[PDB]
Chain A
């Protein structure tokens, strides 16, 4: 990332609308600014049958205030589902080339 975007999160509900999701977002990426975790709780009224988007999949929508410079947007290279973070243990017993 290069800048912190202005994001608003929405989810597709059974009423074929976009319900607000910002109250349940645990953003560790600092508004799409750097790599990190991202966790939410799916609301009970989320729908995979609504006609706003292709059916069979629950949908989340993020609204971003437009940035004039096209190079300010981040360069996404992959999203991991069911993701966790792990850290090495007993680092003092590991060879140096592993860290290099």
Chain B
């Protein structure tokens, strides 16, 4: 990685001096003919030739060393490239496919985080993600006349698309205790949610004891008995409940895989899963085939023959297959568990279904502890991020002035007092500056090619001389002017403002670096801010690993990767590329329509009920209060997000908690409901109507706009009346007003729809046509837009945009809860 062994002959002082003398001959051969060791011109040139050789030697150092900054700068946990740019983050991707969710969920481990118990195990043996079945689809009804929406069935049918059913097949330790598994699963599902999709149901498969009757005959010369029992149980357990096969990165390399396919799919911390078992369908009874168990058992060393392989006592959940002697049908929602709760105890029992016989008629019995000892534990794989560790920082930046190499007879060693000495010092100064700049340019290399935390300078410069030196004293009065020029010629932004050539250079470097990841720089702005535009591009490059890994991920109170990609492509709004940008007033916002819907509730609670216990608590260090309601016989029947406009927040035990923050009405009539509870006449139920149709306020435009006839009036958008997002010409209107034709209400508006609220100040310009410009922006964005999504454009005046920003920020801060802020957000669209 060092150029020195290749170029060590072209860097030498003699080679460079020969080239310099050739130029002197060609250009000034008839005026400068004496070029021996004694010529004063050559001695000055020879010194500069040594400096040129020294500068070239610095460039021929190892590549990794030149990319390493000073010790005080090297960030912890990084290397030549930051940690997030490793293969585990740049070649993988977040779970997109149903199979990807299988891989990501199977990687969960009990030791991933801090734990309550010291048992190391994988939570699930198998999972299966499917779309929500058509029969149980999320349906809701619109009333033709009442103009409202209800979950209870001329009413018309509407369907919400995007919903997953998660079937979980737990392991043995997981079935013992599920509290830790449930908590970790909820955290994973929250942070791995795709745009427009959610898990509407979690199903746990129940175990059914599968008592297998097995008769095995041993060879006459068997040495170890407990070992054969361990092999038999391990082989049989795998044949019934085959576990995923994981490998470390080195093992996958040894198997012949390449890094292209090793880091494929989601990033698994506990081993790679190249091949998975065939995905089963858990919406109907499944099959269990054990015909090959004979082949595997006979392959165990020490096992001679098998005399019986059949099923013992089984309940109705297990039934024999049709015409298959060694296959069985497992009822829907159930999975086969081998030999009950404690297998090894059953084998060691006198009534063991497994019978081992040697020497024709000798029965073999082994205690449980011996079988436990012979069972080995699979080691825990843990793949850490790959790094190219820091090299050795090298003092390339250090510069030694070249006038110090001249002999003492030239007068440059003592302090200058005559005109001749000063003139010689001034003659050499531009050449020392050029050599020093080359040294400073090479020292700037780690910052020039940095993927993140880029600087303000594009060219390396420095002052050649140090303090208390002969050279510094001579140039004392000229240093401020030259240093000012050096800064001007190097910095992108200075006191004078934007340097156009330096600005263009920075764009080219960013575009070259962006081409590493298959993207490119955005077009130069025409009506935008130069500094803001640069922030978009630098943030685009710096967050490349996160942006594409989470290409389809959305979380509450976090700027989605889709919004960042749109901003980067258009080169607008660089404030969104830094975390905790909750006060920066982004030029546009993205809203997921599905977030403004309630969870479909149970049909039991449609009718009114009376709570069996009720209390009010005030949260500490805040003015809000929580209303706690307790009703019996409701375990596992109430869900978070269940919905006037009051949402259930907690499901702790048999009590659910409402919050006064989400509803001002609750914060006002808290005494009245308390009084209603006191006399026992407070009733709660599922909301018969959860959200109504949209009707707009009537607001008249200014007189200047009123250029129509007696039957023509102009209606303007108002802060109390948002502009309709679906208005079409020649549409009948009924006077507040609404659309007489209700086909707008029949159209689906929540399945894979995103709303983009944009400030209208951007298009406020004399020479900008908003409609032509808007069409161009959609064309530019379309290439990188998700295929299964639709976007709605909302133009907002600079005044009501602030109100939307204040409301949306507060809504997301609270956790995106349905309520006054959420319903206000719904109205604004």
In the complex, A touching B (Cβ < 8 A): no
Residues of A within 8 A of B (CB): none
